[PDB]
């Protein structure tokens, strides 16, 4: 099964997912110069003060916090969108040291980890069907650097004990994303793809300029995890990125000069 090793990692994706060498695949480096102002885009609008948090996952890949996504309860809208897209999840990518864990690159420049706030088009009425359309996803990418600590990811460093192997689920109510949030909501946007197998070529990117920062010691818990279930050999959850994909056919826009 594909994973992040040398035998199953992201050179090999394209053997069982073709599209992994396709028109319009995630990430890529945000190159700061050549991106273009867009003075039509939009203020990107986060509503997320009725966000449900329900449930913490490892599904052996990452850590999954996910939400009540049957009402309008955590929407984005504006920016580059049309329509409102519904929040249903949130992850991390991340690395075994600080120097490397972000998808995106900034002018080359890797960050320690990456957020993902995975939002779905409300007109394609699931989840599954939204993967299926050129604009179902909306995916709010934030990058985390080390340096202090951020206040409102702590609840979810302080329950991976609990989720330390593949298939463990704890209950995680009362969760509020705002509190993963930076100050500016300044972002590039484009179009590309899920970064994960099946790589479906289905979101609308928004990728904020601002990262936030995050202790040495909240990454450390998130190295901690493993990838393996429970009585298998340990093989610590690090290193869950895929790098950044040719850009071919795209231009990137920035919301902000
Ligand atoms: S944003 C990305 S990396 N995700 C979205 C949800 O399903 C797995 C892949
Ligand atoms: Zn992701």
Same mark, same amino acid.
């Given at each position: 099964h594909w994973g992040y090793g040398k035998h199953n990692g992201p050179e090999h994706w394209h053997k069982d997912?073709?599209?992994?060498?396709?028109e319009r695949q995630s990430?890529? *480096?945000?190159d700061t110069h050549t991106a273009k102002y867009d003075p039509s885009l939009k203020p990107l609008s986060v509503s997320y003060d009725q966000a449900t948090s329900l449930r913490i996952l490892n599904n052996g890949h990452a850590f999954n916090v996910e #939400? &009540? *996504?049957?009402? &309008?309860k955590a929407v984005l809208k504006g920016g580059p969108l049309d329509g409102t897209y519904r929040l249903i999840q949130f992850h991390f990518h991340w690395g075994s040291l600080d120097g490397q864990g972000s998808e995106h690159t900034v002018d080359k420049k890797k960050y320690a980890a990456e957020l993902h706030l995975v939002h779905w088009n409300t007109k394609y009425g699931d989840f599954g069907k939204a993967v299926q359309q050129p604009d179902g996803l909306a995916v709010l990418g934030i990058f985390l650097k080390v340096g202090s600590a951020k206040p409102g990811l702590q609840k979810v460093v302080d329950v991976l004990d609990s989720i330390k192997t593949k298939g463990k689920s704890a209950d995680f109510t009362? #969760? *509020?994303?705002?509190? @993963?949030?930076?100050?500016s909501l300044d972002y590039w946007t484009y179009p590309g793809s899920?970064?994960?197998?099946? @790589?479906?070529?289905?979101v609308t990117w928004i990728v904020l300029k601002e990262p936030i920062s995050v202790s040495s010691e909240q990454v450390l818990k998130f190295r901690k995890l493993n990838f393996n279930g429970e009585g298998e050999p340990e093989e610590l959850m690090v290193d869950n990125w895929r790098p950044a994909q040719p850009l071919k056919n795209r231009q990137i826009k920035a919301s902000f000069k």
């Open positions: 997912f073709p599209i992994a060498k396709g990430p890529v *480096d945000i #939400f &009540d *996504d049957s009402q &309008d009362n #969760f *509020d994303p705002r509190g @993963l949030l930076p100050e899920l970064t994960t197998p099946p @790589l479906l070529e289905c």
